[PDB]
mmCIF file of C-alpha atoms and ligand atoms in Angstrom:
data_model
loop_
_atom_site.group_PDB
_atom_site.id
_atom_site.type_symbol
_atom_site.label_atom_id
_atom_site.label_comp_id
_atom_site.label_asym_id
_atom_site.label_seq_id
_atom_site.Cartn_x
_atom_site.Cartn_y
_atom_site.Cartn_z
ATOM 1 C CA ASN A 1 -88.277 88.215 3.647
ATOM 2 C CA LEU A 2 -92.077 86.957 3.740
ATOM 3 C CA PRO A 3 -92.072 83.523 3.401
ATOM 4 C CA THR A 4 -92.703 81.727 6.158
ATOM 5 C CA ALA A 5 -90.037 78.929 7.715
ATOM 6 C CA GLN A 6 -92.372 76.164 6.595
ATOM 7 C CA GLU A 7 -93.218 77.744 3.389
ATOM 8 C CA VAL A 8 -89.333 78.102 2.510
ATOM 9 C CA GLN A 9 -88.962 74.461 3.023
ATOM 10 C CA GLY A 10 -91.820 73.702 0.553
ATOM 11 C CA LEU A 11 -90.290 76.048 -1.882
ATOM 12 C CA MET A 12 -86.992 74.564 -1.480
ATOM 13 C CA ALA A 13 -87.933 71.293 -1.780
ATOM 14 C CA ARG A 14 -89.888 71.876 -5.056
ATOM 15 C CA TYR A 15 -87.138 73.532 -6.634
ATOM 16 C CA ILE A 16 -85.064 70.214 -6.343
ATOM 17 C CA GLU A 17 -87.889 68.489 -7.586
ATOM 18 C CA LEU A 18 -87.964 70.793 -11.060
ATOM 19 C CA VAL A 19 -83.912 70.140 -11.214
ATOM 20 C CA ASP A 20 -84.696 66.486 -10.643
ATOM 21 C CA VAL A 21 -87.465 66.512 -13.870
ATOM 22 C CA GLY A 22 -85.347 68.709 -15.811
ATOM 23 C CA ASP A 23 -88.196 71.496 -16.397
ATOM 24 C CA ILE A 24 -85.797 74.452 -17.474
ATOM 25 C CA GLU A 25 -88.459 76.885 -17.647
ATOM 26 C CA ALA A 26 -90.147 75.862 -14.363
ATOM 27 C CA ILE A 27 -86.805 76.473 -12.404
ATOM 28 C CA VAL A 28 -86.555 79.916 -14.258
ATOM 29 C CA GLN A 29 -89.650 81.018 -12.996
ATOM 30 C CA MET A 30 -88.729 80.562 -9.477
ATOM 31 C CA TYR A 31 -86.082 82.777 -9.919
ATOM 32 C CA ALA A 32 -86.795 86.663 -9.324
ATOM 33 C CA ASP A 33 -85.983 88.991 -12.321
ATOM 34 C CA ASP A 34 -82.909 90.230 -10.661
ATOM 35 C CA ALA A 35 -81.560 87.543 -8.997
ATOM 36 C CA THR A 36 -78.000 86.472 -8.787
ATOM 37 C CA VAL A 37 -76.662 83.016 -8.478
ATOM 38 C CA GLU A 38 -73.088 81.822 -7.429
ATOM 39 C CA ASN A 39 -72.617 78.248 -8.679
ATOM 40 C CA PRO A 40 -69.930 77.251 -7.299
ATOM 41 C CA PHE A 41 -69.840 79.657 -4.644
ATOM 42 C CA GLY A 42 -66.163 81.727 -4.971
ATOM 43 C CA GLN A 43 -67.133 82.423 -8.582
ATOM 44 C CA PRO A 44 -68.340 85.431 -10.631
ATOM 45 C CA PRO A 45 -72.270 85.873 -10.218
ATOM 46 C CA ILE A 46 -74.534 85.065 -12.703
ATOM 47 C CA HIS A 47 -77.101 88.007 -12.643
ATOM 48 C CA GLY A 48 -80.862 87.852 -14.034
ATOM 49 C CA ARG A 49 -82.895 85.469 -15.666
ATOM 50 C CA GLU A 50 -81.449 85.347 -18.907
ATOM 51 C CA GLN A 51 -78.008 84.273 -17.476
ATOM 52 C CA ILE A 52 -79.524 82.215 -14.881
ATOM 53 C CA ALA A 53 -81.509 80.492 -17.622
ATOM 54 C CA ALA A 54 -78.227 79.836 -19.464
ATOM 55 C CA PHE A 55 -76.797 77.878 -16.910
ATOM 56 C CA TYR A 56 -79.570 75.712 -16.297
ATOM 57 C CA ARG A 57 -79.891 74.867 -20.030
ATOM 58 C CA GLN A 58 -76.455 74.268 -20.170
ATOM 59 C CA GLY A 59 -76.136 72.002 -17.081
ATOM 60 C CA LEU A 60 -79.375 70.166 -17.251
ATOM 61 C CA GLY A 61 -80.451 70.230 -20.805
ATOM 62 C CA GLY A 62 -77.456 67.854 -21.663
ATOM 63 C CA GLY A 63 -77.329 64.656 -20.691
ATOM 64 C CA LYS A 64 -79.317 62.987 -17.519
ATOM 65 C CA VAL A 65 -79.022 64.743 -14.566
ATOM 66 C CA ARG A 66 -80.863 63.539 -11.408
ATOM 67 C CA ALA A 67 -80.938 65.486 -8.138
ATOM 68 C CA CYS A 68 -82.553 64.387 -4.723
ATOM 69 C CA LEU A 69 -82.659 66.580 -0.855
ATOM 70 C CA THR A 70 -80.493 64.073 1.308
ATOM 71 C CA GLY A 71 -81.686 65.766 4.220
ATOM 72 C CA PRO A 72 -84.310 68.399 5.790
ATOM 73 C CA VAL A 73 -84.346 71.925 4.426
ATOM 74 C CA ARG A 74 -83.337 74.269 7.346
ATOM 75 C CA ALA A 75 -85.374 77.004 7.370
ATOM 76 C CA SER A 76 -84.615 80.484 9.168
ATOM 77 C CA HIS A 77 -87.359 83.343 9.931
ATOM 78 C CA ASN A 78 -86.087 85.884 7.552
ATOM 79 C CA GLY A 79 -87.063 84.046 4.108
ATOM 80 C CA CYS A 80 -83.823 81.931 3.799
ATOM 81 C CA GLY A 81 -82.956 78.282 3.990
ATOM 82 C CA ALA A 82 -80.306 75.966 3.223
ATOM 83 C CA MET A 83 -80.481 72.615 2.007
ATOM 84 C CA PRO A 84 -78.507 69.299 1.331
ATOM 85 C CA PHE A 85 -78.832 67.376 -1.583
ATOM 86 C CA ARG A 86 -76.994 65.184 -4.464
ATOM 87 C CA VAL A 87 -76.837 65.647 -8.074
ATOM 88 C CA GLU A 88 -76.157 62.634 -10.073
ATOM 89 C CA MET A 89 -74.466 62.731 -13.500
ATOM 90 C CA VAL A 90 -72.327 61.110 -16.094
ATOM 91 C CA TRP A 91 -69.168 62.392 -16.759
ATOM 92 C CA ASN A 92 -67.369 61.009 -19.787
ATOM 93 C CA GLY A 93 -69.364 58.027 -19.209
ATOM 94 C CA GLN A 94 -68.136 58.125 -15.938
ATOM 95 C CA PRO A 95 -71.164 57.838 -13.613
ATOM 96 C CA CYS A 96 -70.888 60.554 -10.905
ATOM 97 C CA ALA A 97 -72.489 62.188 -8.055
ATOM 98 C CA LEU A 98 -71.901 65.649 -6.415
ATOM 99 C CA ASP A 99 -73.048 66.389 -2.903
ATOM 100 C CA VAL A 100 -74.215 70.377 -2.710
ATOM 101 C CA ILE A 101 -75.327 72.805 -0.276
ATOM 102 C CA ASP A 102 -77.516 75.476 -1.672
ATOM 103 C CA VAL A 103 -78.579 78.596 0.605
ATOM 104 C CA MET A 104 -81.286 80.565 -0.662
ATOM 105 C CA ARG A 105 -82.833 84.086 0.094
ATOM 106 C CA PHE A 106 -86.680 84.696 -1.033
ATOM 107 C CA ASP A 107 -88.129 87.905 -1.940
ATOM 108 C CA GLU A 108 -91.515 89.092 -0.597
ATOM 109 C CA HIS A 109 -93.434 86.952 -3.548
ATOM 110 C CA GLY A 110 -91.436 83.641 -2.897
ATOM 111 C CA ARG A 111 -89.042 84.083 -5.657
ATOM 112 C CA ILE A 112 -85.551 83.458 -5.166
ATOM 113 C CA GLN A 113 -83.514 86.523 -4.802
ATOM 114 C CA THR A 114 -80.334 84.923 -4.241
ATOM 115 C CA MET A 115 -78.742 81.581 -4.232
ATOM 116 C CA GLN A 116 -75.188 80.271 -3.635
ATOM 117 C CA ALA A 117 -74.146 76.564 -4.046
ATOM 118 C CA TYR A 118 -71.061 75.121 -1.839
ATOM 119 C CA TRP A 119 -69.243 72.477 -3.500
ATOM 120 C CA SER A 120 -65.953 71.581 -5.318
ATOM 121 C CA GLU A 121 -64.229 68.430 -6.817
ATOM 122 C CA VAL A 122 -63.782 67.384 -3.072
ATOM 123 C CA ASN A 123 -67.488 66.769 -3.359
ATOM 124 C CA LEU A 124 -67.517 65.025 -6.325
ATOM 125 C CA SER A 125 -68.037 60.736 -6.074
ATOM 126 C CA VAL A 126 -68.372 57.712 -8.727
ATOM 127 C CA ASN B 1 -59.180 82.471 2.086
ATOM 128 C CA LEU B 2 -56.506 80.532 2.261
ATOM 129 C CA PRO B 3 -57.328 76.915 3.590
ATOM 130 C CA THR B 4 -57.904 74.766 0.639
ATOM 131 C CA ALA B 5 -61.072 72.937 0.328
ATOM 132 C CA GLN B 6 -59.709 69.906 1.713
ATOM 133 C CA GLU B 7 -58.564 71.654 4.788
ATOM 134 C CA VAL B 8 -61.786 73.332 5.198
ATOM 135 C CA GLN B 9 -63.532 69.685 5.303
ATOM 136 C CA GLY B 10 -61.119 69.127 8.143
ATOM 137 C CA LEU B 11 -61.434 72.202 10.052
ATOM 138 C CA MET B 12 -65.365 72.019 9.874
ATOM 139 C CA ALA B 13 -65.388 68.191 10.980
ATOM 140 C CA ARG B 14 -63.004 69.130 13.947
ATOM 141 C CA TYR B 15 -65.406 71.654 15.024
ATOM 142 C CA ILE B 16 -67.876 69.306 15.274
ATOM 143 C CA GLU B 17 -65.911 66.809 17.223
ATOM 144 C CA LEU B 18 -65.160 69.685 20.116
ATOM 145 C CA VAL B 19 -68.754 70.653 20.082
ATOM 146 C CA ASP B 20 -69.708 66.745 20.803
ATOM 147 C CA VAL B 21 -67.520 66.559 23.125
ATOM 148 C CA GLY B 22 -67.857 69.884 24.764
ATOM 149 C CA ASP B 23 -64.259 71.071 24.588
ATOM 150 C CA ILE B 24 -65.423 74.715 24.746
ATOM 151 C CA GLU B 25 -61.910 75.859 25.221
ATOM 152 C CA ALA B 26 -60.560 74.461 22.088
ATOM 153 C CA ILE B 27 -63.706 75.759 20.470
ATOM 154 C CA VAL B 28 -63.207 79.218 21.078
ATOM 155 C CA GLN B 29 -59.732 79.042 19.818
ATOM 156 C CA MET B 30 -61.088 77.893 16.652
ATOM 157 C CA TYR B 31 -62.737 81.405 16.136
ATOM 158 C CA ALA B 32 -60.835 84.744 15.198
ATOM 159 C CA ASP B 33 -60.702 86.960 18.059
ATOM 160 C CA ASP B 34 -63.127 89.504 16.701
ATOM 161 C CA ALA B 35 -65.235 86.801 14.689
ATOM 162 C CA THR B 36 -69.043 87.101 14.168
ATOM 163 C CA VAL B 37 -71.475 84.216 14.932
ATOM 164 C CA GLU B 38 -75.354 84.432 13.912
ATOM 165 C CA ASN B 39 -77.112 81.478 15.392
ATOM 166 C CA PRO B 40 -79.831 81.591 14.742
ATOM 167 C CA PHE B 41 -79.460 82.660 11.444
ATOM 168 C CA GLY B 42 -81.933 85.637 11.219
ATOM 169 C CA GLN B 43 -80.856 86.873 15.060
ATOM 170 C CA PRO B 44 -78.367 89.511 15.768
ATOM 171 C CA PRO B 45 -74.712 88.923 15.365
ATOM 172 C CA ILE B 46 -72.565 88.244 18.536
ATOM 173 C CA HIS B 47 -69.107 89.326 17.956
ATOM 174 C CA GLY B 48 -65.555 88.503 19.433
ATOM 175 C CA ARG B 49 -64.398 85.585 21.611
ATOM 176 C CA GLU B 50 -65.794 86.740 24.670
ATOM 177 C CA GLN B 51 -69.394 86.705 23.586
ATOM 178 C CA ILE B 52 -68.887 83.553 21.345
ATOM 179 C CA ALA B 53 -67.235 81.677 24.415
ATOM 180 C CA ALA B 54 -70.637 82.814 26.493
ATOM 181 C CA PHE B 55 -72.845 81.112 23.671
ATOM 182 C CA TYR B 56 -71.051 77.483 23.780
ATOM 183 C CA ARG B 57 -70.471 77.985 27.644
ATOM 184 C CA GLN B 58 -74.511 78.137 28.077
ATOM 185 C CA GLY B 59 -75.265 76.222 25.243
ATOM 186 C CA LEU B 60 -73.328 73.115 26.062
ATOM 187 C CA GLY B 61 -73.601 73.792 29.479
ATOM 188 C CA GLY B 62 -73.924 70.730 31.570
ATOM 189 C CA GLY B 63 -72.797 68.294 28.642
ATOM 190 C CA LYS B 64 -75.268 66.378 27.560
ATOM 191 C CA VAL B 65 -75.753 67.438 24.101
ATOM 192 C CA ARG B 66 -73.909 65.288 21.502
ATOM 193 C CA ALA B 67 -73.494 66.474 17.670
ATOM 194 C CA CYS B 68 -72.736 64.649 14.762
ATOM 195 C CA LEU B 69 -72.198 65.513 10.990
ATOM 196 C CA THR B 70 -74.937 63.906 8.976
ATOM 197 C CA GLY B 71 -73.359 64.332 5.332
ATOM 198 C CA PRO B 72 -69.931 65.382 3.664
ATOM 199 C CA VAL B 73 -68.608 69.175 4.293
ATOM 200 C CA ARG B 74 -69.417 70.949 1.326
ATOM 201 C CA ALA B 75 -66.302 73.103 0.788
ATOM 202 C CA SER B 76 -65.362 75.804 -1.933
ATOM 203 C CA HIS B 77 -62.161 77.524 -2.916
ATOM 204 C CA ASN B 78 -62.425 80.696 -1.189
ATOM 205 C CA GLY B 79 -62.130 79.635 2.197
ATOM 206 C CA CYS B 80 -65.751 78.763 2.928
ATOM 207 C CA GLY B 81 -67.674 75.310 3.916
ATOM 208 C CA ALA B 82 -71.185 74.315 4.600
ATOM 209 C CA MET B 83 -72.006 71.212 6.541
ATOM 210 C CA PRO B 84 -75.233 69.325 7.685
ATOM 211 C CA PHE B 85 -75.244 68.281 11.157
ATOM 212 C CA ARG B 86 -77.703 66.981 13.861
ATOM 213 C CA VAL B 87 -77.495 68.393 17.633
ATOM 214 C CA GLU B 88 -79.147 66.089 20.329
ATOM 215 C CA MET B 89 -80.076 67.452 23.477
ATOM 216 C CA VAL B 90 -83.077 67.663 26.104
ATOM 217 C CA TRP B 91 -86.096 69.921 26.421
ATOM 218 C CA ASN B 92 -86.557 69.772 29.979
ATOM 219 C CA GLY B 93 -87.382 65.835 30.080
ATOM 220 C CA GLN B 94 -87.838 64.616 26.746
ATOM 221 C CA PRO B 95 -85.137 64.120 24.338
ATOM 222 C CA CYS B 96 -85.133 65.827 20.926
ATOM 223 C CA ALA B 97 -83.284 66.482 17.742
ATOM 224 C CA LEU B 98 -82.020 69.508 15.614
ATOM 225 C CA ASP B 99 -81.215 69.584 12.385
ATOM 226 C CA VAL B 100 -78.922 72.352 11.366
ATOM 227 C CA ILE B 101 -76.612 73.340 8.528
ATOM 228 C CA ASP B 102 -73.707 75.933 9.407
ATOM 229 C CA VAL B 103 -71.872 78.007 7.075
ATOM 230 C CA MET B 104 -68.284 79.158 7.837
ATOM 231 C CA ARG B 105 -65.645 81.457 6.508
ATOM 232 C CA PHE B 106 -62.286 80.898 7.213
ATOM 233 C CA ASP B 107 -59.118 83.513 7.251
ATOM 234 C CA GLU B 108 -55.546 83.316 6.165
ATOM 235 C CA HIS B 109 -54.835 81.841 9.616
ATOM 236 C CA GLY B 110 -57.363 78.837 9.482
ATOM 237 C CA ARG B 111 -59.636 80.253 11.889
ATOM 238 C CA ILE B 112 -63.351 81.089 11.753
ATOM 239 C CA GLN B 113 -64.111 84.611 10.606
ATOM 240 C CA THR B 114 -67.867 84.080 10.378
ATOM 241 C CA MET B 115 -70.056 81.549 11.141
ATOM 242 C CA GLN B 116 -74.197 81.246 10.448
ATOM 243 C CA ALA B 117 -76.523 78.540 11.669
ATOM 244 C CA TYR B 118 -79.412 77.873 9.794
ATOM 245 C CA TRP B 119 -82.534 76.069 11.638
ATOM 246 C CA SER B 120 -85.770 76.827 13.358
ATOM 247 C CA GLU B 121 -88.790 75.149 15.217
ATOM 248 C CA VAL B 122 -89.134 73.503 11.979
ATOM 249 C CA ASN B 123 -86.256 71.441 12.688
ATOM 250 C CA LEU B 124 -86.899 70.114 15.765
ATOM 251 C CA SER B 125 -88.195 66.895 16.572
ATOM 252 C CA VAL B 126 -88.992 64.826 19.322
HETATM 253 C C1 LIG C 201 -74.209 72.147 -13.589
HETATM 254 C C2 LIG C 201 -74.197 70.279 -12.878
HETATM 255 C C3 LIG C 201 -75.426 70.096 -12.891
HETATM 256 C C4 LIG C 201 -76.443 70.595 -12.408
HETATM 257 C C5 LIG C 201 -75.581 71.219 -10.828
HETATM 258 C C6 LIG C 201 -74.308 71.183 -10.356
HETATM 259 C C7 LIG C 201 -73.888 71.812 -9.471
HETATM 260 C C8 LIG C 201 -74.458 72.764 -8.495
HETATM 261 C C9 LIG C 201 -76.027 72.576 -8.810
HETATM 262 C C10 LIG C 201 -76.528 73.819 -8.063
HETATM 263 C C11 LIG C 201 -78.230 73.669 -8.181
HETATM 264 O O1 LIG C 201 -78.821 74.190 -7.200
HETATM 265 C C12 LIG C 201 -78.935 72.614 -9.365
HETATM 266 C C13 LIG C 201 -77.964 71.873 -10.317
HETATM 267 C C14 LIG C 201 -76.624 72.234 -9.723
HETATM 268 C C15 LIG C 201 -73.325 70.630 -11.421
HETATM 269 C C16 LIG C 201 -71.885 70.874 -11.739
HETATM 270 C C17 LIG C 201 -71.288 70.066 -12.903
HETATM 271 C C18 LIG C 201 -73.003 69.967 -13.614
HETATM 272 O O2 LIG C 201 -72.967 68.868 -14.403
HETATM 273 C C1 LIG C 202 -77.778 75.370 22.081
HETATM 274 C C2 LIG C 202 -78.443 74.436 21.253
HETATM 275 C C3 LIG C 202 -77.283 73.124 21.470
HETATM 276 C C4 LIG C 202 -76.070 73.424 20.638
HETATM 277 C C5 LIG C 202 -76.294 74.298 19.491
HETATM 278 C C6 LIG C 202 -77.936 74.901 19.024
HETATM 279 C C7 LIG C 202 -78.201 75.246 17.783
HETATM 280 C C8 LIG C 202 -77.046 75.572 16.866
HETATM 281 C C9 LIG C 202 -76.048 75.320 17.098
HETATM 282 C C10 LIG C 202 -74.681 75.630 16.100
HETATM 283 C C11 LIG C 202 -73.596 74.930 16.466
HETATM 284 O O1 LIG C 202 -72.575 75.550 15.390
HETATM 285 C C12 LIG C 202 -73.231 74.373 17.532
HETATM 286 C C13 LIG C 202 -74.113 74.219 18.409
HETATM 287 C C14 LIG C 202 -75.419 74.416 18.293
HETATM 288 C C15 LIG C 202 -78.797 74.433 19.854
HETATM 289 C C16 LIG C 202 -79.965 75.316 20.119
HETATM 290 C C17 LIG C 202 -80.773 74.860 21.080
HETATM 291 C C18 LIG C 202 -79.610 74.099 22.161
HETATM 292 O O2 LIG C 202 -80.000 73.173 22.982
#
């Protein structure tokens, strides 16, 4: 919980950039060795870098996916933040957009220790 | 964890409407009797309707606080949702805005069991 509120905003905005460019390896480097991801929130967690890498490779490696912040990063003083963003993709030739909110907790080294993504079919658009 | 994702979106949007009008009575009844609120996230939890009512009583006090959703409510399938919104008030003279993200978990009765508000000074503008 060492990153400042300002640092958290920057780290979170960076993450979106890496997702937008699709640099799978740079995204995985942002996560702690033992990070846990819940995406979508409510599903069993993804534990560790190896499994976390598989998620991003499978989700971003495929077609063309774009991601943009749709509002400012809300940052707390205990190394946590939440951000609203939109993910654009094509599903079976159908152009789609998914609205998502990610909540992240960072460790003392500025690495993502926990990530939870809030979204469901209700957040899907065309 | 029983309201559907569509129900969560409705409940959360209603909450913003009540905050906007300042209906402190209706807000408190949205909460479970032993609910917990962490606002701002990082600060110690306020528990139970009495304490929660005090928060809204003093925060929305006079009636010069406006609140509006600034994007869709993201809802999961386990009774949780997260939403982006802006609060407008006055800092002893000059009008300012605060960008916040609320994450809420609902119970089998459609009542807010837990609420966490993400924000800090980095989200305050004049
Ligand atoms: C995996 C995915 C692309 C990336 C992505 C999704 C959902 C939530 C995300 C949250 C992130 O923080 C980063 C990327 C995604 C989509 C779900 C459907 C899809 O194609
Ligand atoms: C209390 C407050 C007005 C309402 C409000 C604030 C912060 C987080 C909130 C979260 C809510 O879910 C509902 C209302 C607020 C502001 C903090 C400074 C202020 O004037």
